[PDB]
Amino acid sequence: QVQLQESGPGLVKPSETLSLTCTVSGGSISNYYWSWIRQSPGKGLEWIGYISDSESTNYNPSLKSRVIISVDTSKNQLSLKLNSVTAADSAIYYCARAQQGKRIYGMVSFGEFFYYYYMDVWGKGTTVTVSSASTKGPSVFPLAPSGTAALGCLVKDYFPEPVTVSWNSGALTSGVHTFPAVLQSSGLYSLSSVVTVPSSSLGTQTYICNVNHKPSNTKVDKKVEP
Amino acid sequence: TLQCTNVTNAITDDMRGELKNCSFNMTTELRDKKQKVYSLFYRLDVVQINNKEYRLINCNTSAITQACPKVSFEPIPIHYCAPAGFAILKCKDKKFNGTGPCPSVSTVQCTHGIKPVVSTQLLLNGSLAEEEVMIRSENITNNAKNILVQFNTPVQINCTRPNNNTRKSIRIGPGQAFYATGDIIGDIRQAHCNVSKATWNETLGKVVKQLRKHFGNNTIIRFANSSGGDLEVTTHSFNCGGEFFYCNTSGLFNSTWISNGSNDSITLPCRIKQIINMWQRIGQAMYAPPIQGVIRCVSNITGLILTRDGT
Amino acid sequence: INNKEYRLINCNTSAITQACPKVSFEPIPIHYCAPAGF
Amino acid sequence: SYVRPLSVALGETASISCGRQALGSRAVQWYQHRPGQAPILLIYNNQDRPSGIPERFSGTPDINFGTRATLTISGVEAGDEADYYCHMWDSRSGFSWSFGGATRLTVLGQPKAAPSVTLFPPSSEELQANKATLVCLISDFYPGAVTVAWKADSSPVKAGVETTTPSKQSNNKYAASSYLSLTPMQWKMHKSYSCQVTHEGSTVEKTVAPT
Numbered sequence: 001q002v003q004l005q006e007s008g009p010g011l012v013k014p015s016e017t018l019s020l021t022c023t024v025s026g027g028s029i030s031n032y033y034w035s036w037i038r039q040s041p042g043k044g045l046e047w048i049g050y051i052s053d054s055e056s057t058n059y060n061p062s063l064k065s066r067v068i069i070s071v072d073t074s075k076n077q078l079s080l081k082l083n084s085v086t087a088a089d090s091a092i093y094y095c096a097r098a099q100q101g102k103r104i105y106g107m108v109s110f111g112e113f114f115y116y117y118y119m120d121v122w123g124k125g126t127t128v129t130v131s132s133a134s135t136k137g138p139s140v141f142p143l144a145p146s147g148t149a150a151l152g153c154l155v156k157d158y159f160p161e162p163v164t165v166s167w168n169s170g171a172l173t174s175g176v177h178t179f180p181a182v183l184q185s186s187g188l189y190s191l192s193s194v195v196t197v198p199s200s201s202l203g204t205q206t207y208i209c210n211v212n213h214k215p216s217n218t219k220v221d222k223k224v225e226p
Numbered sequence: 227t228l229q230c231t232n233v234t235n236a237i238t239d240d241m242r243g244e245l246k247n248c249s250f251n252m253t254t255e256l257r258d259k260k261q262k263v264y265s266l267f268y269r270l271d272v273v274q275i276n277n278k279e280y281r282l283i284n285c286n287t288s289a290i291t292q293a294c295p296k297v298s299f300e301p302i303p304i305h306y307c308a309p310a311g312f313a314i315l316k317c318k319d320k321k322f323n324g325t326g327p328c329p330s331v332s333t334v335q336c337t338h339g340i341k342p343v344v345s346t347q348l349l350l351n352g353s354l355a356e357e358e359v360m361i362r363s364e365n366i367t368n369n370a371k372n373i374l375v376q377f378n379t380p381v382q383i384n385c386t387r388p389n390n391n392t393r394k395s396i397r398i399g400p401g402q403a404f405y406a407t408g409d410i411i412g413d414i415r416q417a418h419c420n421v422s423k424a425t426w427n428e429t430l431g432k433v434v435k436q437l438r439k440h441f442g443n444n445t446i447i448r449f450a451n452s453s454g455g456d457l458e459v460t461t462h463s464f465n466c467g468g469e470f471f472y473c474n475t476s477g478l479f480n481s482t483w484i485s486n487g488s489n490d491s492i493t494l495p496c497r498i499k500q501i502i503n504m505w506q507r508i509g510q511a512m513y514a515p516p517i518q519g520v521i522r523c524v525s526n527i528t529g530l531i532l533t534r535d536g537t
Numbered sequence: 538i539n540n541k542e543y544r545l546i547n548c549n550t551s552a553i554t555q556a557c558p559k560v561s562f563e564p565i566p567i568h569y570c571a572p573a574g575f
Numbered sequence: 576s577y578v579r580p581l582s583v584a585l586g587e588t589a590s591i592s593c594g595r596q597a598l599g600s601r602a603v604q605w606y607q608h609r610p611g612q613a614p615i616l617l618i619y620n621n622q623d624r625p626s627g628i629p630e631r632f633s634g635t636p637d638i639n640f641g642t643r644a645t646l647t648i649s650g651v652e653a654g655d656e657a658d659y660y661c662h663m664w665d666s667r668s669g670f671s672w673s674f675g676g677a678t679r680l681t682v683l684g685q686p687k688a689a690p691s692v693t694l695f696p697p698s699s700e701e702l703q704a705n706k707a708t709l710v711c712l713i714s715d716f717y718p719g720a721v722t723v724a725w726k727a728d729s730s731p732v733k734a735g736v737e738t739t740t741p742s743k744q745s746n747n748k749y750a751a752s753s754y755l756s757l758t759p760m761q762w763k764m765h766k767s768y769s770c771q772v773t774h775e776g777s778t779v780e781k782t783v784a785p786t
């Protein structure tokens with residue numbers, strides 16, 4: 001009933017205000033708690049902060065000096081702002097709904113309790129890279145094939161991660177295998193997607209390769225044929 | 227000189243400081259070698275210097291002596307007896323005032339069991355009246371003579387210190403061992419007492435009825451909390467399992483009664499002291515050693531010690 | 538202590554009190570008696 | 576934060592002890608996290624687990640003090656490989672900002688799977704752009720560790736090769752890629768190019784040639 005979707009720039013220059021947004025679907029936004037969580041390479045899950053239903057904010061003291069969390073009740077969009085970013089700030093920024101738990105051990109009158117929060121429904125994550133390097137759209141090249149056979153769609157030299165790939169605009173979904181990218185020494189990622197289709201389907205089921213690199217708004221398409 | 231910090235912050239505002247984690251240099255078995263040990267002291271037992279430096283409350287007035295932890299502060303009933311050739315006369319009048327001619331008299335060699343309980347405001351574990359709820363004062367019309375009421379029904383009270391304490395022996399010298407408060411296993415909670423709001427309201431009304439006989443069926447009497455003084459007299463101070471409780475009683479004497487709950491109880495926020503001073507002479511005080519485990523005593527409230535102010 | 542440092546054997550357990558050297562540890566025969574009527 | 580490893584045989588029961596023990600009454604949250612994916616709140620209150628989570632995931636309630644917080648995974652499967660976090664709240668300590676350590680559960684005894692190598696020659700549009708790249712795609716192998724070897728005809732080739740570290744697939748197997756870059760003249764001036772993929776103790780070769 002409730003799903004979350006993050007959205008970010010993907011690339012932010014060093015010493016600049018990062019900005020991400022998170023849309024709630026199905027439920028309201030001003031009646032729950034929401035938490036920003038990021039996960040850097042090598043470093044574990046780090047809690048950035050959270051906002052209440054009454055739109056009260058509380059930040060992690062690790063990044064308290066430079067994080068501003070907001071909320072827009074006109075729809076279900078809550079925003080995040082992080083200034084003075086460095087290379088160590090590149091991570092997958094997740095968005096989740098925090099549920100307030102009141103753990104009571106003694107008497108509620110004397111205040112012998114405490115509040116704990118837990119994220120029950122998360123987003124999918126927005127990849128954010130901090131680098132002085134500029135963005136670049138990929139270059140798609142077809143991989144013609146030759147029980148069954150396999151064709152591919154090479155996606156080389158783009159920056160930064162990621163790149164979404166679908167076959168036949170989402171129609172072809174079985175036997176698809178999209179491989180992780182490769183960070184070449186030149187500093188650009190290179191991807192490769194491949195589907196395994198029956199041999200008789202070569203003539204002439206059209207196979208359209210969809211490639212989307214949002215950090216450059218450079219969507220492309222390409223067909224494959226022997 | 228004690229170096230004190232709060233023990234385990236984030237509880238409920240002015241509550242981290244109610245008990246402190248104090249560390250201090252201490253003598254050892256060798257007089258030339260010191261030791262840096264720590265101990266948990268309650269806030270009522272320490273005072274600042276004016277930094278986080280503290281000292282024991284008694285040091286500028288009284289010497290201190292910790293009770294031999296093998297002795298028991300539990301009251302045992304005592305029977306006072308008269309020597310041979312003497313006699314004890316008991317007034318068996320069920321509605322006796324305390325003075326005047328008692329019609330029914332009997333003689334005994336020894337009095338009944340009398341527990342030497344030393345409490346305040348509330349008379350604990352005492353003997354009950356058989357009829358009504360008597361009221362005794364030498365000059366009741368005098369406002370400076372304490373009224374000693376005595377119930378016929380015991381209104382039960384449940385006191386507890388829920389903190390699971392630890393006693394850490396510290397040798398301060400050859401043979402001498404000071405028993406410090408190590409740490410607290412589990413939650414750091416608040417000591418308190420429960421008393422059934424229904425029974426306390428019922429028993430507080432009986433005192434009102436018997437108070438009408440000395441001030442008129444038409445007058446209005448009111449219960450207010452203590453008007454000041456030392457800590458032992460402004461609170462329901464007593465002893466429960468070794469530790470000396472000091473219970474705020476504003477929730478028991480906050481009622482006005484006209485000329486003419488039922489489920490929950492009223493709780494009493496109690497503080498705890500360890501360096502309790504002497505009640506007679508000055509320059510003397512006792513250190514109650516820390517009691518291990520959870521303390522919870524169940525006792526009767528059989529009387530009160532009230533005071534009028536001169537409607 | 539663990540060097541040539543030592544301490545008295547009793548210091549970690551018991552206080553110590555030297556006998557007034559004018560008193561004599563020499564045993565003197567004692568006669569226990571019963572009160573009158575015993 | 577640091578990562579402490581843990582190994583459990585396939586089908587057994589796992590015992591993941593929490594990183595930091597509680598000083599008082601606690602409220603422990605368990606999150607299942609596989610890198611590059613959204614964490615999954617397994618258990619929020621000391622033993623309460625949300626819907627959509629099997630009963631084989633269980634925690635320890637806070638009954639009497641002293642009991643340590645441990646996440647129990649009975650009937651462990653290959654999908655239970657992830658990072659598990661102990662979000663420890665208690666009366667004593669302050670606000671639990673840190674998720675704590677990370678127990679890297681690795682399920683042992685999984686079936687060994689052989690790769691599915693597939694080599695693609697340089698595309699025509701790439702050769703038209705005066706560049707040429709061989710791609711050697713590997714999939715469906717376990718344990719996730721292989722070694723790629725490129726050969727121009729018979730002689731080895733190591734200048735110009737890039738390789739992905741293995742990555743877990745949705746079917747709990749692994750996949751990696753290998754990109755050999757060469758000028759279009761080197762692609763034509765050689766007879767054939769091979770990609771030898773060595774997994775466990777066996778090598779597999781897929782070759783391609785400009786014909």
Ligand SMILES: *[C@@H]1O[C@H](CO)[C@@H](O[C@@H]2O[C@H](CO)[C@@H](O[C@@H]3O[C@H](CO[C@H]4O[C@H](CO[C@H]5O[C@H](CO)[C@@H](O)[C@H](O)[C@@H]5O[C@H]5O[C@H](CO)[C@@H](O)[C@H](O)[C@@H]5O)[C@@H](O)[C@H](O[C@H]5O[C@H](CO)[C@@H](O)[C@H](O)[C@@H]5O)[C@@H]4O)[C@@H](O)[C@H](O[C@H]4O[C@H](CO)[C@@H](O)[C@H](O)[C@@H]4O[C@H]4O[C@H](CO)[C@@H](O)[C@H](O)[C@@H]4O[C@H]4O[C@H](CO)[C@@H](O)[C@H](O)[C@@H]4O)[C@@H]3O)[C@H](O)[C@H]2NC(C)=O)[C@H](O)[C@H]1NC(C)=O
Nearest residue numbers: 100101102104105106107108384386420600621636637638
């Ligand atoms: C003198 O007078 C004093 C003053 O009266 C008096 O002080 C009293 O002291 C006692 C103990 O010293 C105190 O008792 C404690 O009470 C705590 C609170 O319990 C109440 O609340 C819980 C939780 O309520 C939420 O959940 C329920 C459903 O589960 C909802 O219906 C609620 O609405 C609420 O949920 C909403 O609200 C939340 C915030 O408000 C939101 O966040 C949430 O999302 C929701 O919106 C209830 O479950 C309790 O119900 C139980 O009690 C009723 C009677 O009230 C009974 O019918 C029945 O037994 C119910 O089970 C209750 O209403 C308790 O949490 C606490 O017990 C836990 O803690 C202690 C130590 O902290 C543990 O040792 C103990 O084992 C318990 O641990 C269990 O529970 C915790 C909490 O979840 C778990 O984390 C833990 O793992 C463990 O779980 C295990 O047991 C569970 C059941 O016990 C089980 O479900 C699990 O599956 C697992 O097996 C303790 O009992 C009391 O509060 C004081 N009084 C006052 C007024 O404060 C003193 O005693 C007097 N006498 C003297 C001094 O001598």
Ligand SMILES: COc1cnc(-c2csc(CN(C)CCCN(C)C)n2)c2[nH]cc(C(=O)C(=O)N3CCC([C@@H](C#N)c4ccccc4)CC3)c12
Nearest residue numbers: 291344345458463464465470502503504505506510511512
């Ligand atoms: C604690 O009280 C004491 C503390 N320390 C010493 C002491 C130290 S050393 C020494 C020997 N010294 C060398 C010879 C004489 C001194 N000379 C040097 C002149 N005696 C005491 N001795 C008699 C005491 C009492 O009876 C008394 O006042 N209580 C005891 C009972 C309570 C009590 C109960 N339940 C209670 C306390 C607080 C709140 C509520 C109830 C009330 C007060 C007494």
Ligand SMILES: *[C@@H]1O[C@H](CO)[C@@H](O[C@@H]2O[C@H](CO)[C@@H](O[C@@H]3O[C@H](CO)[C@@H](O)[C@H](O)[C@@H]3O)[C@H](O)[C@H]2NC(C)=O)[C@H](O)[C@H]1NC(C)=O
Nearest residue numbers: 231232233234246247248249262263264265266408409410
């Ligand atoms: C009161 O304050 C004292 C400090 O003056 C506390 O003692 C110290 O407590 C810390 C934290 O537990 C101890 O550090 C721990 O050491 C163990 C053993 O190596 C280690 O495994 C832990 O990770 C941690 O580093 C420290 O040793 C200890 N020092 C002494 C002299 O006791 C004391 O705990 C406080 N008490 C209360 C009730 O707050």
Ligand SMILES: *[C@@H]1O[C@H](CO)[C@@H](O[C@@H]2O[C@H](CO)[C@@H](O[C@@H]3O[C@H](CO)[C@@H](O)[C@H](O)[C@@H]3O)[C@H](O)[C@H]2NC(C)=O)[C@H](O)[C@H]1NC(C)=O
Nearest residue numbers: 300301343345350351464465466467468522523524525526
């Ligand atoms: C009023 O009188 C009652 C009854 O005599 C007193 O209750 C007694 O309280 C003491 C300590 O609070 C209890 O001793 C404890 O026993 C438990 C259980 O064995 C043990 O774990 C403790 O270490 C300690 O020895 C005693 O059993 C208890 N007696 C009864 C019959 O319940 C009460 O303390 C008195 N209150 C006052 C203010 O005098």
Ligand SMILES: *[C@@H]1O[C@H](CO)[C@@H](O[C@@H]2O[C@H](CO)[C@@H](O)[C@H](O)[C@H]2NC(C)=O)[C@H](O)[C@H]1NC(C)=O
Nearest residue numbers: 269270272273274282283284285286287288457
């Ligand atoms: C010993 O020190 C205590 C602590 O200051 C003194 O108690 C204070 O006395 C003043 C009056 O001069 C009160 O205003 C304070 O409230 C007291 N402090 C408390 C109760 O914590 C005490 O008077 C000193 N004794 C002597 C003999 O100087």
Ligand SMILES: *[C@@H]1O[C@H](CO)[C@@H](O[C@@H]2O[C@H](CO)[C@@H](O)[C@H](O)[C@H]2NC(C)=O)[C@H](O)[C@H]1NC(C)=O
Nearest residue numbers: 350351352354378379380381382524525526527
């Ligand atoms: C609290 O009051 C009750 C009621 O008087 C006491 O219970 C009585 O105790 C006497 C003395 O041993 C017995 O003769 C009665 O038979 C008891 N009656 C009942 C109904 O129990 C109780 O002992 C008192 N508690 C304390 C701690 O003094």
Ligand SMILES: *[C@@H]1O[C@H](CO)[C@@H](O[C@@H]2O[C@H](CO)[C@@H](O)[C@H](O)[C@H]2NC(C)=O)[C@H](O)[C@H]1NC(C)=O
Nearest residue numbers: 389390391392410411412518519520639640641
């Ligand atoms: C108070 O804390 C002590 C420990 O500091 C607890 O003592 C333990 O009691 C259990 C009983 O099941 C024993 O198995 C342990 O061996 C004891 N440990 C020690 C160090 O003595 C005691 O149970 C606690 N009290 C309460 C009421 O929880």
Ligand SMILES: *[C@@H]1O[C@H](CO)[C@@H](O[C@@H]2O[C@H](CO)[C@@H](O)[C@H](O)[C@H]2NC(C)=O)[C@H](O)[C@H]1NC(C)=O
Nearest residue numbers: 382383384385419420421422423491523524525
């Ligand atoms: C004080 O505590 C005592 C015992 O802990 C309570 O007495 C118990 O009352 C229940 C009522 O449901 C009985 O079932 C038990 O048998 C009683 N125990 C004993 C030892 O008599 C009493 O109710 C408490 N009173 C308050 C005001 O808290």
Ligand SMILES: *[C@@H]1O[C@H](CO)[C@@H](O[C@@H]2O[C@H](CO)[C@@H](O)[C@H](O)[C@H]2NC(C)=O)[C@H](O)[C@H]1NC(C)=O
Nearest residue numbers: 255397401403538544545546547548549550551
């Ligand atoms: C005080 O110190 C003495 C000296 O070490 C202790 O006596 C030793 O006790 C151990 C057992 O723990 C024996 O193995 C040694 O043989 C004893 N030393 C002797 C007899 O010279 C004594 O136990 C200490 N007392 C305390 C209370 O710690």
Ligand SMILES: *[C@@H]1O[C@H](CO)[C@@H](O)[C@H](O)[C@H]1NC(C)=O
Nearest residue numbers: 230231232239240242243278
């Ligand atoms: C103890 O806590 C109180 C309340 O937060 C604070 O005012 C006080 O300064 C603290 N004392 C120490 C020694 O930390």
Ligand SMILES: *[C@@H]1O[C@H](CO)[C@@H](O)[C@H](O)[C@H]1NC(C)=O
Nearest residue numbers: 227228229249250251262263
């Ligand atoms: C103990 O004495 C030393 C001096 O050697 C001092 O530095 C230290 O602060 C003292 N400790 C305490 C707790 O006062």
Ligand SMILES: *[C@@H]1O[C@H](CO)[C@@H](O)[C@H](O)[C@H]1NC(C)=O
Nearest residue numbers: 323324325326363364365366
């Ligand atoms: C106490 O009661 C007796 C009973 O006759 C009475 O004479 C006396 O005046 C009373 N004293 C007080 C102070 O009530």
Ligand SMILES: *[C@@H]1O[C@H](CO)[C@@H](O)[C@H](O)[C@H]1NC(C)=O
Nearest residue numbers: 364365366367368369370536
């Ligand atoms: C009692 O006190 C009142 C005034 O407080 C006084 O008039 C009266 O004489 C006193 N009674 C006795 C017997 O002293």
Ligand SMILES: *[C@@H]1O[C@H](CO)[C@@H](O)[C@H](O)[C@H]1NC(C)=O
Nearest residue numbers: 435438439441442443444486
């Ligand atoms: C007061 O009222 C009671 C009835 O509750 C009655 O018995 C008594 O005689 C009255 N006394 C006076 C002085 O009015």
Ligand SMILES: *[C@@H]1O[C@H](CO)[C@@H](O)[C@H](O)[C@H]1NC(C)=O
Nearest residue numbers: 451452453454460474475476
């Ligand atoms: C009596 O009650 C008043 C009402 O708030 C309070 O301010 C005062 O501190 C109380 N006194 C005692 C001794 O509890």
Ligand SMILES: *[C@@H]1O[C@H](CO)[C@@H](O)[C@H](O)[C@H]1NC(C)=O
Nearest residue numbers: 451460461474475476477495
């Ligand atoms: C006693 O409690 C009342 C309220 O319960 C509070 O206003 C008052 O300050 C307390 N007295 C003391 C001395 O703490």
